[PDB]
Design a protein around this motif. Structure first.
Motif, PDB file in Angstrom:
ATOM      1  N   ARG A 113     -14.871  14.566 -38.204  1.00 45.38           N
ATOM      2  CA  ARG A 113     -16.003  13.642 -38.198  1.00 45.38           C
ATOM      3  C   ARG A 113     -16.567  13.378 -36.806  1.00 45.38           C
ATOM      4  NH1 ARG A 113     -15.121   9.404 -38.473  1.00 45.38           N
ATOM      5  NH2 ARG A 113     -16.926   8.029 -38.790  1.00 45.38           N
ATOM      6  N   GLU A 114     -15.750  12.788 -35.940  1.00 42.12           N
ATOM      7  CA  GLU A 114     -16.181  12.467 -34.584  1.00 42.12           C
ATOM      8  C   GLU A 114     -16.499  13.706 -33.751  1.00 42.12           C
ATOM      9  OE1 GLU A 114     -12.963   9.784 -33.123  1.00 42.12           O
ATOM     10  OE2 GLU A 114     -14.345   8.205 -33.768  1.00 42.12           O
ATOM     11  N   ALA A 115     -16.179  14.880 -34.283  1.00 44.29           N
ATOM     12  CA  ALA A 115     -16.438  16.131 -33.575  1.00 44.29           C
ATOM     13  C   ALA A 115     -17.800  16.704 -33.953  1.00 44.29           C
ATOM     14  CB  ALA A 115     -15.345  17.144 -33.881  1.00 44.29           C
ATOM     15  N   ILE A 116     -18.030  16.881 -35.249  1.00 43.05           N
ATOM     16  CA  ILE A 116     -19.294  17.421 -35.736  1.00 43.05           C
ATOM     17  C   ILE A 116     -20.478  16.598 -35.236  1.00 43.05           C
ATOM     18  CG2 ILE A 116     -20.727  17.808 -37.769  1.00 43.05           C
ATOM     19  CD1 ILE A 116     -18.695  19.924 -37.526  1.00 43.05           C
ATOM     20  N   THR A 117     -20.253  15.303 -35.036  1.00 41.43           N
ATOM     21  CA  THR A 117     -21.307  14.409 -34.570  1.00 41.43           C
ATOM     22  C   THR A 117     -21.446  14.386 -33.051  1.00 41.43           C
ATOM     23  OG1 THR A 117     -19.781  12.520 -34.620  1.00 41.43           O
ATOM     24  CG2 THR A 117     -21.135  12.904 -36.577  1.00 41.43           C
ATOM     25  N   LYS A 118     -20.318  14.411 -32.346  1.00 41.74           N
ATOM     26  CA  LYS A 118     -20.333  14.382 -30.886  1.00 41.74           C
ATOM     27  C   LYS A 118     -20.317  15.791 -30.296  1.00 41.74           C
ATOM     28  CE  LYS A 118     -18.005  10.967 -28.958  1.00 41.74           C
ATOM     29  NZ  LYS A 118     -16.915  10.167 -28.337  1.00 41.74           N
ATOM     30  N   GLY A 119     -20.236  16.794 -31.167  1.00 46.44           N
ATOM     31  CA  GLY A 119     -20.205  18.171 -30.706  1.00 46.44           C
ATOM     32  C   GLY A 119     -21.387  19.001 -31.171  1.00 46.44           C
ATOM     33  N   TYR A 120     -22.102  18.516 -32.181  1.00 48.55           N
ATOM     34  CA  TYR A 120     -23.258  19.236 -32.704  1.00 48.55           C
ATOM     35  C   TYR A 120     -24.426  18.313 -33.037  1.00 48.55           C
ATOM     36  CZ  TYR A 120     -19.866  23.048 -33.262  1.00 48.55           C
ATOM     37  OH  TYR A 120     -18.911  24.013 -33.040  1.00 48.55           O
ATOM     38  N   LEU A 121     -24.219  17.435 -34.014  1.00 48.83           N
ATOM     39  CA  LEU A 121     -25.244  16.491 -34.457  1.00 48.83           C
ATOM     40  C   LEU A 121     -26.150  15.986 -33.338  1.00 48.83           C
ATOM     41  CD1 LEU A 121     -25.340  14.902 -37.500  1.00 48.83           C
ATOM     42  CD2 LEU A 121     -23.908  16.893 -37.000  1.00 48.83           C
ATOM     43  N   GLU A 122     -25.552  15.527 -32.244  1.00 49.01           N
ATOM     44  CA  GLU A 122     -26.326  15.021 -31.118  1.00 49.01           C
ATOM     45  C   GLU A 122     -26.425  16.056 -29.999  1.00 49.01           C
ATOM     46  OE1 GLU A 122     -23.455  11.778 -31.119  1.00 49.01           O
ATOM     47  OE2 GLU A 122     -23.168  12.100 -28.966  1.00 49.01           O
TER      48      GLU A 122
END
Length: 220
Positions: A113-122
């Motif tokens: 969770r905290e990866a896909i968002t802090k690693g891709y999403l943004e």
């Protein structure tokens, strides 16, 4: 308590198998309701093979594609990221289906969770419009990913007493058959002696009875 009561683990078990089909089921329905996911999962289906194919053969895809593809296969438990590898998974006999069937409960909160968002999403180059231009295939994916990671972020004390009842009655019965040895073994030494006392009585009958005979002769 071991045949009538102990059988309750089969009656009170009707919850572990029935109510269990209600846990995953309940979250499944309200999962396909909040537009977000549906809106994307519907665009993930309508993806031409003309797009997913070309990308599979691509040797060095543009970053906007690399990220989109890396993020999707990553959520499927594939901690992998290397393009050469994630490439194969793009056309596996289950991948394309492994998306719409993405269990919104397998969105590992710690890393996934905290990866896909802090690693891709943004990411400056991971926007819907940006990616779509590089490929109409991996495009809708960011629309699905931003729907999964973004969504999911908004979602035993009575039966163990059976182990206290079933055990107290199983253990208690375990000492009742062991107590039998207290009566059978007690009678063991009894039957051996109760028999010997009989040996005397019988053998004594002869000496005493045979004397009433011999004494009768001597007297005469």
């Amino acid at each position: 308590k071991q045949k009538d009561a102990r059988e309750l683990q089969v009656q009170l078990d009707v919850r572990n198998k029935e109510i269990a089909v209600q846990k995953v089921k309940a979250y499944a329905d309200l999962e396909k309701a909040e537009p977000a996911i549906i809106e994307a999962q519907e665009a993930v289906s309508t993806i031409k093979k003309k797009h997913l194919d070309e990308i599979k053969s691509l040797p060095k895809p543009p970053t906007p594609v690399k990220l989109a593809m890396e993020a999707v296969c990553l959520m499927l438990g594939g901690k992998k990221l290397e393009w050469a590898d994630i490439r194969k998974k793009i056309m596996e006999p289950n991948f394309i289906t492994s998306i719409i069937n993405y269990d919104t409960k397998k969105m590992m909160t710690p890393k996934i969770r905290e990866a896909i968002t802090k690693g891709y999403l943004e990411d400056p180059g991971f926007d819907y419009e940006t990616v779509n231009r590089a490929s109409k295939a991996c495009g809708p994916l960011v629309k699905w990913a931003t729907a999964q990671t973004y969504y999911s972020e908004i979602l035993k004390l009575k039966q163990d007493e059976i182990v206290a009842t079933i055990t107290a009655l199983e253990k208690s019965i375990a000492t009742y058959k062991e107590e039998y040895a207290t009566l059978i073994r007690e009678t063991e030494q009894i039957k051996t002696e109760s028999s010997k006392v009989k040996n005397k009585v019988d053998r004594s009958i002869a000496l005493l009875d045979n004397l009433n005979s011999e004494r009768g002769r001597w007297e005469q």
